[PDB]
Design a protein around this ligand. Structure first.
Ligand SMILES: [C][C]C([O])([C][C])[C][C][C][C]C1234B567B189B21%10B32%11B543B645B786B917B%1021B3%114C6571[C][C]O[C][C]([O])[C][C][O]
Lengths: 238, 10
């Protein structure tokens, strides 16, 4: 069953998430104002930038993450950043209208807002489909934080050095998730739940890939790169 | 180098 360590792992992750995800979305007011020719870029650039900071705050609390070297921690964050932001955004996504509801109407985002950031349906369509399938899973918050932590500590991320150590940390998280599903997730919602969760990690790899492509495209234009932030440039590329 | 990421990591 759920050993003491595993129960500890869940509590730590839950708290780490609670300390990095503000469901009141109060900070969105500090971002450059959203405008509804890439009129949403300044706003979403700031939102993404803000989100990267929050994802880092979460990662540092992942039991074992700090044991990794500086370079491996950096490699994991740069490669998973966009994936965890997509994954954590599911919390504000609504299947009512396929949009992300972050408090007010000014901070309620849809397919048009993302396109107005310079992205095409080649990314947006599968992004919504992802959000929909993840939502359909109705994960317990415990499963949600474990999935984000597992996504961050992935051994196959390019540039990783101590893959062995990275894999050990992730396996400890995986076994925690698997065991939690058996012991705390009642059927039928638990039916192949683990496998479906891992499929979403594969889905994220594909989304990451497409995002990077469109990002390289968008940021290649100095006028667009100019509207981004220093953190976004450092993490996503320059 | 990643100064900002590094700074946020420590
Ligand atoms: C700046 C790089 C860029 O490539 C431009 C060159 C733009 C990429 C923007 C990526 C996005 B925004 B849009 B998708 B994902 B983020 B944000 B917006 B949509 B998803 B997430 C979305 C929904 C908002 O989520 C709110 C979450 O509760 C908070 C996330 O912590």
């Amino acid at each position: 069953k759920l050993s003491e360590e595993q129960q500890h792992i869940i509590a730590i992750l839950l708290d780490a998430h609670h300390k990095t995800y503000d469901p009141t979305y109060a900070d969105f007011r500090d971002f450059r104002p959203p405008v509804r020719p890439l009129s949403m870029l300044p706003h979403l650039a700031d939102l993404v930038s803000y989100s990267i900071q929050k994802v880092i705050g979460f990662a540092k609390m992942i039991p074992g993450f700090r044991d990794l070297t500086s370079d491996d921690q950096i490699v994991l964050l740069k490669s998973s950043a966009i994936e965890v932001i997509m994954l954590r955004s599911n919390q504000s996504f609504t299947m009512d209208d396929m949009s992300w509801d972050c408090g007010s109407q000014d901070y309620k985002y849809d397919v048009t807002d993302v396109s107005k950031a310079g992205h095409t349906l080649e990314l947006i369509e599968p992004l919504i489909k992802f959000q929909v399938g993840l939502k359909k899973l109705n994960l317990h918050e415990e499963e949600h934080v474990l999935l984000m932590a597992i996504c961050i500590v992935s051994p196959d991320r390019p540039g990783v050095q101590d893959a062995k150590l990275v894999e050990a940390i992730q396996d400890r998280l995986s076994n925690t998730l698997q065991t939690y599903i058996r012991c705390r997730h009642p059927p039928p919602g638990s039916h192949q739940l683990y496998a479906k969760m891992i499929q979403k990690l594969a889905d994220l790899r594909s989304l990451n890939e497409e995002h990077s492509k469109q990002y390289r495209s968008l940021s290649f234009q100095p006028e667009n790169s100019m509207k981004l932030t220093p953190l976004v440039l450092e993490v996503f590329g320059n | 180098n990643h100064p900002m990421l590094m700074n946020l990591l420590k």
